[PDB]
Design a binder for this molecule. Structure first.
Ligand SMILES: Cc1cc2nc3c(=O)[nH]c(=O)nc-3n(C[C@H](O)[C@H](O)[C@H](O)COP(=O)(O)OP(=O)(O)OC[C@H]3O[C@@H](n4cnc5c(N)ncnc54)[C@H](O)[C@@H]3O)c2cc1C
Ligand SMILES: Cc1cc2nc3c(=O)[nH]c(=O)nc-3n(C[C@H](O)[C@H](O)[C@H](O)COP(=O)(O)OP(=O)(O)OC[C@H]3O[C@@H](n4cnc5c(N)ncnc54)[C@H](O)[C@@H]3O)c2cc1C
Lengths: 453, 453
C-alpha cells in the first residue's frame, strides 16, 4: 500500500489522514504536541466559547432596551468559565480527533517531532526519547503556524500573552493592552472587554487594514461604543514590566495595563523541518510554496494549511488536506477558493466572500457597488441596533454578484447565502427576485441587491 | 390611463399601488383604518420588537454560562417598552407606507370602507361620512384577514385578547393562558413568558400540527425547558371572567389566569365587500379564490395577500400584489412559491422551505432524509445549547435537495442558504462540497448534507 507520511494533526493533517486511508494507503501521522492542533485546542473552539460567554456578559450589562429592562454589572468567575471551556475543548478533542485517529487502525500515530532526513524519509525525535525513521512514498507537511512576536524593545523579556495564554487565563485582567489589529487580536480584545477588562487596542494603521475600509470603520465605531479604546496609527516603542504591571511607551504616551496580548500575526512552523534536505522551497515569510494541488517543489511532498500561504481558516486547511490526500493517492484534485467565506467573530460580526471593490479594480475588473447601512435593514431597526452594513460588488457589464462584505450581527450566517449566489453565478437582479424572510438579517442581501436598479 | 382600484394598504396593496403607478396607471387606494395594514401596525414589526425585548430579558434571567456569569431577575417596565415599541412602529409607518403613498401623487388615497357596487365600480363609505363611487377598469382586493374566534361558551363575553390587544398591552400579566398553537400564538406565548408571565398554552393537538412533527417536538421541549406549560391535546370547554381573572374549564382541569390570548388562526376579511355583486367567488373558509396570476372568477378583479388562501407572510403578500399589478396593467406574471422560506420567531427559531418528508410522499415523490440534531453542530456545542435540529429532504433518485426544516437559533438566517440551493436545483453532494464558515449555524446545512454519503 502507498506509504503516506503526515506531519501534524490539525485540520489539514486530519483531513489528509482520513482521506489517504479511505484510498487504501498506509498512514503514519507524526504529532509533536497535543492531538488536534490549533483550532480545537487553542484556537477556534476555545475563542468562540469565550466570545459567547462575553456575549452573555455584555447583554447583561447593557442593551438597546435598557429603558424598560434593568441591566446589572454581572459578577464574573473566570475560573469557572475557564473550567467549563476546557471541559468542552477536551470533549471535542476526544470525539473528533483522538477518537477518530484511534478509530482507524490503518493510521499509525507517532508522538514526536519530525524533520526530513532526506527526500524519501523523516527522522522523528520521539517525545519519550530516542529516534525513529519514517519512510514514505508521499508526505504531507501540515505543521501550522505560531504567534508572531514583533521586535519591540523589552517585549521579549516581559511575561506577555499570545492568544494561547489569553485563552487559558484563569482571571480577567483589570486592564488589558492589545498589540495588533488582526482577526485574533480583535476577537479577543472585545471578548475580554465584555468580560470586565478595560481594553486598549494598538493598531499600527487602521483595523482590518487589508480589508475594504468600511469594515474597519464599522468595527472601530462598535468597539468605542462599548468602551474599548482603539488607538489607530499607534505603536509601542518600548515595553517594560514592573510592580505587577506592563508599562508601554506609545505614540499616545505612556500606557499601563495588568496584562499584554500580542496578536500581530502567525508565522508558519518550518524551522524544525530541515526542508532543505528534501528540496522543499519556502517564500520570504517562511511559508511553504505550493501549487493548486498542494504540491511543493518536491513533487512527492505536499503542504497544506497554516504552514503555507493559504488563508488561515480551519475549513481551508481541511479542504487543502483532503485534496492533498487525493493527489498523493493517484487522484487529481485542486483547491478552489472562489466562493470562500471569511468570518470574524466580533460583535457585530464581519463576513466577506469574493472580491472587494479595490481587489476587483486591482485585477482590472469594472464594477459597481451598493452599501446598505443597517439603519435600512428591518431586523436591525427592530433590534434598535443599526451599526454595520451589507456591501455588494458586481461586475459592471453583466451585473453578476462577485463580492459581498458585511459587518452586522449574524453576518457569518448571511454571508453563506451570498457565497452560494456567487457560486451559482447569479446577478443581483436574480438574487433580489428571490423571496427572503422579512425581519431576518439575510433579508439585507435582497434589499441591498434591489438598490442596483 | 388605466384606472386601477386597490382595496387595502398592507403589503399586498402597497406593492400593487407602486407597481401599477410604475406602469403609468392611475391608482385609487381605499383604506378603512390605519395606513400600512397588519404587518407594520399590529403584526410583524411590533411582535418582533417584543420578541427581541423578551430575548434580552431571558438572557438576563438565565444562560448556559450561569456557572461563571451571575444572572438576575430583570426588573421589567412594560409601559416604557411599549412606548419604545410604538415609536418605532410609527416611524416605520411614516417612512415606508404613508410617506410612500404621499410620495406618488399618481396614487389617490381614500379613507373609507369599500364594497363592490357592481362589476365595474366600488361604493366607499367615507370615514368622515358620506359616500363616494370609484370606477375602475381593474381592481385588486387586498383586505387581509382578522383574528379567528373559536365558539367556546363564555369566550365571546369575556375581555380576552387577540394578538392586537396583547401587543398593545401596557402591563405583563402575572399569568397568561393562550389558546392556540399557531405561529402567532407561540411567538407571543414565549415573548410574554420571558417578559415575566407564567404562561400556559392550550393546543388542540400538538404544536405546529401542520408541520413535520420534529418541529413541534423541539419547540415543545424548548418551551418547557424555560417554564412554559404546554398542554397538548387540550381544549377549553368554558371561559368565565370574575374578580379580575379568567377561569377556564379544560381537559387538564380548572385553569386560572389574569389575561387570555386567543390565537387560533386568521380569517379573510371579505364580508364588507359584497363580493357577490361583482362575481368574485370565495371558498369554504371565505378566502377569495385566485389563480397563478392572482385573478379572481371576475377577470377584471384580482386578489392577493391574507384575504386569499396564500401563505400568510408579508413578503408573499407583497410579491402577490406586485405581480397582480403587472397583470392588471397588461403584463403577464405568476407567483412562484417553490423556494418560499417560512420563519417562526420563537427561540430557537423554526424555519422551513420546500417539501417535508410527508408532503413529498403525499405527492408521490420518493425521498431520503437526514436529521442532524444540534448536539452535532459545532456552533451549538460552543454555545452550550444543543436543542434543535436541521433536517434535509432529497429526491431519492437524483439526490436533489427539495426541502429543509430546522429548529435552531438563527434558523431564519440559515434557511435562506437552503432556499437558494433548492432554487439552483443543487444536490446535497454539491452543497456539502461548498466551503462553509466553521462555528456558524449555517455550517449545520453542510454537516447534514454530508451524512447522506
Ligand atoms: C485564537 C485563534 C482563533 C481562531 N478562530 C478561527 C475560527 O473561528 N475559524 C477558522 O476557520 N479558523 C480559526 N483560526 C485558525 C485556525 O485555527 C487554523 O487556521 C487551523 O487550525 C490551521 O490548521 P492546520 O492543520 O493547518 O494547523 P494546526 O492546527 O496549527 O496544527 C499543526 C500541527 O502540527 C504540529 N507540528 C508542527 N511542527 C511539527 C513537527 N515538526 N513534528 C510534528 N508535529 C509538528 C503542531 O504541533 C500542530 O499540532 C483561529 C486561530 C487562532 C490562533
Ligand atoms: C401578530 C402577527 C405577527 C406576524 N409576524 C409576521 C412575520 O414575522 N413575518 C411575515 O412575513 N408575516 C408576519 N405576519 C403576517 C403578516 O402580517 C400578514 O400576512 C400581512 O400583513 C398581510 O398583508 P396583506 O396586505 O395581505 O393584509 P393586511 O396588511 O392585513 O391589510 C389589509 C388592509 O385592508 C384594509 N381593509 C380590509 N377591508 C377593507 C375594506 N372593505 N375597505 C377598505 N380597507 C379594507 C385593512 O384594514 C388593512 O389595512 C404576522 C401577523 C400577525 C397578526
Amino acid at each position: 500500500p502507498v506509504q503516506v507520511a503526515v506531519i501534524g494533526s490539525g485540520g489539514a493533517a486530519m483531513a489528509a489522514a482520513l482521506k489517504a486511508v479511505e484510498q487504501g494507503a498506509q498512514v503514519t501521522l507524526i504529532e509533536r504536541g497535543t492531538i488536534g492542533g490549533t483550532c480545537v485546542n487553542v484556537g477556534c473552539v476555545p475563542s468562540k466559547i469565550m466570545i459567547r460567554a462575553a456575549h452573555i456578559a455584555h447583554l447583561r450589562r447593557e442593551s438597546p432596551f435598557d429603558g424598560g429592562i434593568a441591566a446589572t454589572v454581572p459578577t464574573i468567575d473566570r475560573s469557572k468559565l475557564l473550567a467549563q471551556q476546557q471541559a468542552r475543548v477536551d470533549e471535542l478533542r476526544h470525539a473528533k480527533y483522538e477518537g477518530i485517529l484511534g478509530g482507524n487502525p490503518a493510521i499509525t500515530v507517532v508522538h514526536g517531532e519530525a524533520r526530513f532526513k532526506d527526500d524519501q524519509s523523516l527522522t522523528v525525535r520521539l517525545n519519550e526519547g530516542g529516534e525513529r525513521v519514517v519512510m514514505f512514498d508521499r508526505c504531507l507537511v501540515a505543521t501550522g503556524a505560531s504567534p508572531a512576536v514583533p521586535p519591540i524593545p523589552g517585549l521579549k523579556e516581559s511575561p506577555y500573552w499570545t492568544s494561547t495564554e489569553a485563552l487559558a487565563s484563569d482571571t480577567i485582567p483589570e486592564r488589558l493592552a492589545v498589540i495588533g489589529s488582526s482577526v485574533v487580536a480583535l476577537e479577543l480584545a472585545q471578548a475580554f472587554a465584555r468580560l470586565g477588562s478595560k481594553v486598549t487596542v494598538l493598531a499600527r494603521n487602521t483595523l482590518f487594514f487589508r480589508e475594504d475600509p468600511a469594515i474597519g470603520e464599522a468595527v472601530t465605531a462598535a468597539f468605542r461604543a462599548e468602551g474599548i479604546e482603539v488607538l489607530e496609527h499607534t505603536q509601542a516603542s518600548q515595553v517594560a514590566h514592573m510592580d505587577g504591571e506592563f508599562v508601554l511607551t506609545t505614540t499616545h504616551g505612556e500606557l499601563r495595563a495588568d496584562k499584554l496580548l500580542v496578536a500581530t500575526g502567525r508565522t508558519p512552523n518550518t524551522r524544525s523541518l530541515a526542508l532543505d534536505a528534501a528540496g522543499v522551497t519556502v517564500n520570504a515569510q517562511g511559508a511553504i510554496v505550493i501549487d493548486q494541488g498542494m504540491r511543493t517543489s518536491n513533487p512527492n511532498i505536499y503542504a497544506a494549511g497554516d504552514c503555507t500561504d493559504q488563508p488561515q481558516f480551519v475549513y481551508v486547511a481541511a479542504a487543502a488536506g483532503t485534496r492533498a490526500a487525493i493527489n498523493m493517492t493517484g487522484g487529481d484534485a485542486a483547491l478552489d477558493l472562489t466562493a470562500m467565506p471569511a468570518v470574524v467573530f466580533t460583535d457585530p460580526q464581519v463576513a466577506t466572500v469574493g472580491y472587494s471593490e479595490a481587489e476587483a479594480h486591482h485585477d482590472g475588473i469594472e464594477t459597481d457597488s451598493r452599501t446598505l447601512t443597517l439603519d435600512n435593514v428591518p431586523r436591525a431597526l427592530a433590534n434598535f441596533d443599526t451599526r454595520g452594513f451589507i456591501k455588494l460588488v458586481i461586475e459592471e457589464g453583466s451585473h453578476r454578484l462577485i463580492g459581498v462584505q458585511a459587518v452586522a450581527p449574524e453576518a457569518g450566517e448571511l454571508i453563506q447565502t451570498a457565497a452560494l449566489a456567487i457560486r451559482n453565478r447569479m446577478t443581483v437582479q436574480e438574487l433580489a427576485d428571490q423571496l427572503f424572510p422579512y425581519l431576518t438579517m439575510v433579508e439585507g442581501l435582497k434589499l441591498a441587491a434591489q438598490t442596483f436598479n
